[PDB]
RNA sequence: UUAAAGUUGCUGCAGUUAAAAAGCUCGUAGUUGGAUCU
RNA sequence: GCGCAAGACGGACCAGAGCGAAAGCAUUUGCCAAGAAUGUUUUCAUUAAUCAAGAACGAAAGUCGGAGGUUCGAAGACGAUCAGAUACCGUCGUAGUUCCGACCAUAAACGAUGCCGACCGGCGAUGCGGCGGCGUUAUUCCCAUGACCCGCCGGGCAGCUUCCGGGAAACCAAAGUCUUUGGGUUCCGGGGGGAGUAUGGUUGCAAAGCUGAAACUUAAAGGAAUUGACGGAAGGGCACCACC
């Protein structure tokens, strides 16, 4: 948001954001990811702003509709709890998901079977998705993340703070984005909100 | 010890992920779908390829396996996927926040929010394990 | 070449340790360099508690323990399996073995 | 770069890191080169135009790269005051 | 080893000094 | 002890630009550490700084524009003449078309080329590439 | 980091420092104002006094030296000067 | 005998494991020495 | 079992904890002088860093005289084992081990890494001093004061992690900031042996310490890491041509 009054986060957004228990993050905290966070509550939580949290929401939407063919974005998660919502943003902007454990030598080895060539990749959890985020420093890969107060930012170009552990929060962050892309490229209107509800996106345990 | 091989199981895992709408749970007739479809050699490859196959398809009913693939399975899960309740989890009458929190949201010129209820916080400052 | 950090021992900061002498041998090893075990028992084994219960005048009597610490050199910890070799990456493991499971 | 005739004898001219002034050489294969797009100030979808970043895999090994790209966002307008 | 050898060296020497004195 | 300040400068200038850094604070300042930075500054390889005064020695904070390969000092001030100056480039320049050596003469602290054109000699400061 | 302002540090910033180690050398002691609850004179005492100070003529002792900052009695009031 | 020898190293070498930092501290000569004045 | 005495020794608490220039330092209490760190809007005002000569201390063993001699124990005397044992095992046991006063000046005396100063990534702990902050506890209260809890600052012993950079590598936040080569200064090395030997000088009661060659001989000796082979090194598996 270039301080637009049109991109700026409306309270029916702020409300999303404390029910699923994105501002609250972790016990520890890296040193890279100090400029996010608001203040440290005694219990030892760290609160994450949700004003940066939308800034970088939405520069990570910008580098995404740069993006001329939908199908370069790869998204990925590794955790159950980022499957639902990385194969429900792919079904909505065109994007390649991948679901599950990611195979070394995707992006490095140009005879195996599921080899591609992304263009930008956006990963749920920096921690856990290691592998694809490391891999794309030998191929030219920008990285987009979701990050929490403990997250590493190596090979991280747009960190976006946020929870990224509760089911609520990953399913409400990716559903968020989503949405921002698409209001962006032009597809749906910014006034009526949009009829696809977050629960689309969440992780049941069964 | 009676244990397959990889060629029987890649050629029933094949069988079932191409042929699922005919293939059931009875031996007698998948050794007889097998026969017509797949060309197989002798009767005891053929046997052995289409025992697995209904040991295999019991396991799918359980739920889903992670070497096969079958698009009617796909709309399934979209189906079940496709779920959304009546009325949302992120939808609160009301919300708990911290005091820290609320100030956060001040800072936000979100201090007319009318969900929101300051709660109180844990006094003792003891959030650590006890080391040794 | 080297093989520990440490040298082997636990010595930092300064220059000299009593010595102590080795459970087994009577050998003189640094005392921060000697393997230590505190043992715990009791007096008598699980083959003679049946048989000394039935001969005790005290109702609910606990019997008693035996604590004994115990100072082993580098050969002796070795050569009766209190101490095993392991490989170059696994010795810096320095957590207690899982026993208390 | 250039001879005294004024004529340019360079095979080619690299890039240069928009945070750390440093040349992307032939084989930086950590190197990347991002596009963030720019919107209307009405109605905010997408104009057909971008900003242009490349950062060095030097510093994007260190971890500089995520604070690197908000400042230079910053700088630009794109990212708003704090 | 060569503490031996040091020790051995050293003997030698102990009955040199006996046998080449300034009184010879 | 602290020995030859301008040395001290000097390193820790070297050291932050090698870790991709826009500023650096040099302490103590001193009037040849201004002047050497001043130096630079007019080649295009440092940019603006600034003297914080503390009632003592005061401090510099010095901007980068990452355009610095090396800043070194001499130790010991060899006096230079200006037969000699010609030996001393070829053994600290990268080369011919790049690069200064930073002197002190009785006309003032300047670079080798300076001090050609002025036809003085001087004592050798340090070097900068 | 990689982009401190070394020039402008915050408030809390300096305050945290060592007080050689800030921008500008300061003391972390004060001059404070005390008064005894008998007497009626009142007494400027250093922080960090390191000799009991007591009373002219009234004949009170209004701090006792510690290993820091000076220790009041009890009943003696105090405030920072300016 | 010179270069090769950056294997005598001022330019310009080495001293944890290959050759090698005195057991440790004091201390005279020697060597070196913080801002600051148009 | 109850007493008496003699000398030696300070267990368990005891830690990758503390102190000291290093050797080194552990029962209570008292006296004597000393010391670091922290605190400081005190004082002097360059008074400093490293050091030929020259000095102080310096484990253990060893040498001279006095005292005492529990235990252990070079030498020695035996009993075993063994093909042989002048050894490893066992029984005794001299000097010594202890104290007082003089010599001796050596150790894998090691972090195998001189000292002083600047810059260069994170994280959690720990010892000391100081500063701040909810709340527990010294029983119900006044404040300080202690024991916990959460942080910040300085000086210490260390630990984990890292594509900081180095290196032959092992590895090292120093062993980094080195062909992009200069902060100050002391000592010391130049293929392997002969050889730390001979000789001269010097110190010492002695044993020995310090300084210290050459003739001659030799094409390698050596350091890291890698595949095997082997181990009277540790863990697993299989076989009626293995056992049960
Ligand atoms: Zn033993």
Redesign the pocket.
């Given at each position: 948001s270039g301080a637009l009054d049109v991109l700026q986060m409306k309270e029916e957004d702020v409300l999303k954001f404390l029910a699923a228990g994105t501002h609250l993050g972790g016990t520890?905290?890296?040193?890279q990811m100090e400029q996010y966070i608001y203040k440290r509550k005694?219990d030892?939580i760290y609160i994450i702003n949700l004003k940066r949290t939308w800034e970088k929401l939405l520069l990570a939407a910008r580098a995404i509709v740069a993006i001329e063919n939908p199908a370069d974005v790869s998204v990925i998660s590794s955790r159950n709890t980022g499957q639902r919502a990385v194969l429900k943003f792919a079904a909505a902007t065109g994007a390649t998901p991948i679901a599950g454990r990611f195979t070394p030598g995707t992006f490095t080895n140009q005879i195996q079977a599921a080899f591609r060539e992304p263009r930008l990749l956006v990963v749920t959890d920096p921690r856990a998705d290691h592998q694809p985020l490391t891999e794309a420093?030998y191929v030219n890969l920008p990285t987009i993340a979701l990050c929490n107060t403990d997250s590493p930012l190596?090979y991280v170009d747009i960190a976006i703070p946020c929870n990224n552990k509760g089911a609520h929060s990953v399913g409400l962050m990716w559903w968020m984005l989503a949405r921002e892309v698409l209001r962006m490229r032009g597809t749906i209107s910014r006034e009526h909100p949009w009829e696809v509800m977050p629960d689309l996106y969440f992780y049941r345990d069964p | 010890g009676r244990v397959r091989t990889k060629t029987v199981k890649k050629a029933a895992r094949v069988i079932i992920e191409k042929y699922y709408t005919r293939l059931g749970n009875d031996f007698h007739t998948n050794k007889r779908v097998c026969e017509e479809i797949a060309i197989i050699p002798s009767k005891k490859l053929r046997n052995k390829i289409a025992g697995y196959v209904t040991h295999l398809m019991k396991r799918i009913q359980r739920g889903p396996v992670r070497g096969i693939s079958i698009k009617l399975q796909e709309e399934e899960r979209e189906r079940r996927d496709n779920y959304v309740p009546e009325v949302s989890a992120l939808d609160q009458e009301i919300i708990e926040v911290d005091p820290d929190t609320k100030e956060m949201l001040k800072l936000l010129d979100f201090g007319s929010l009318s969900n929101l209820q300051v709660t109180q916080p844990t006094?003792?400052?003891?959030?650590?394990t006890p080391?040794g | 070449?080297?093989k520990r950090?440490?040298?082997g021992?636990?010595?930092?900061?300064?220059?000299?340790?009593?010595p102590?002498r080795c459970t087994n041998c009577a050998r003189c090893v640094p005392?921060?360099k000697a393997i230590?075990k505190?043992v715990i028992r009791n007096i008598v084994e699980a083959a003679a508690v049946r048989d000394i219960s039935e001969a005790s005048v005290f109702d609910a009597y606990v019997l008693p323990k035996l604590?004994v610490?115990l100072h082993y050199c580098v050969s002796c910890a070795?050569h009766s399996?209190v101490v095993?070799?392991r490989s170059?990456e696994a010795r810096?493991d320095?957590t207690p073995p899982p026993r208390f499971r | 770069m250039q001879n005294d005739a004024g004529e340019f004898v360079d095979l080619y001219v690299p890039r240069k890191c928009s945070a750390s002034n440093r040349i992307i050489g032939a084989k930086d294969h950590?190197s990347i080169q991002m596009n963030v797009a720019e919107v209307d100030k009405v109605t905010g979808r997408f104009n057909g135009q971008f900003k242009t970043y490349a950062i060095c895999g030097?510093i994007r090994?260190?971890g500089e790269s995520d604070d690197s790209i908000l400042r230079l966002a910053k700088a630009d307008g794109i990212v708003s005051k704090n | 080893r060569?503490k031996w050898?040091?020790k051995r060296?050293?003997?030698?020497?102990?009955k040199?000094?006996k046998m080449?004195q300034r009184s010879k | 002890?602290?020995?030859?300040?301008?040395?001290?400068a000097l390193?820790?200038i070297?050291?932050?630009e090698?870790?991709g850094?826009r500023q650096v604070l040099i302490?103590?300042?001193?009037?040849?550490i201004v002047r050497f930075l001043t130096v630079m500054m007019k080649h295009g390889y440092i940019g603006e700084f600034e003297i914080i005064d503390d009632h003592?020695?005061?401090k510099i904070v010095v901007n980068l524009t990452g355009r610095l390969?090396?800043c070194?000092?001499?130790?010991?001030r060899?006096d230079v003449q200006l037969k000699d100056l010609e030996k001393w480039q070829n053994?600290?320049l990268?080369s011919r078309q790049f690069g200064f050596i930073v002197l002190t003469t009785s006309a003032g602290i300047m670079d080798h080329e300076e001090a050609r054109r002025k036809h003085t000699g001087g004592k050798i400061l340090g070097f900068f590439? | 980091?990689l982009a401190k302002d070394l020039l402008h540090p915050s408030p809390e910033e300096e305050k945290?420092?060592?007080?050689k180690?800030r921008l500008v050398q300061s003391?972390?002691?004060?001059?404070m104002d005390v008064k005894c609850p008998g007497c009626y004179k009142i007494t400027t005492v250093?922080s960090?006094a390191?000799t009991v100070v007591l009373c002219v003529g009234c004949s009170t002792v209004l701090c006792q030296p510690?290993?820091?900052?000076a220790?009041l009695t009890?009943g003696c009031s105090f405030r920072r000067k300016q």
């Open positions: 520890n905290l890296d040193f005694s030892g420093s190596r | 006094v003792g400052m003891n959030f650590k080391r | 070449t080297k950090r440490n040298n021992r636990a010595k930092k900061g300064r220059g000299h340790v009593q102590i005392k921060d230590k505190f604590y610490k070795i399996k095993r070799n170059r810096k320095r | 950590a030097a090994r260190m | 060569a050898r040091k060296m050293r003997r030698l020497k102990r040199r000094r080449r | 002890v602290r020995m030859n300040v301008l040395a001290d390193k820790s070297n050291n932050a090698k870790r850094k302490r103590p300042c001193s009037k040849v003592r020695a005061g390969n090396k070194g000092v001499i130790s010991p060899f053994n600290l990268p590439f | 980091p945290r420092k060592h007080k180690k003391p972390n002691s004060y001059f250093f960090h390191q510690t290993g820091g900052k220790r009890e």
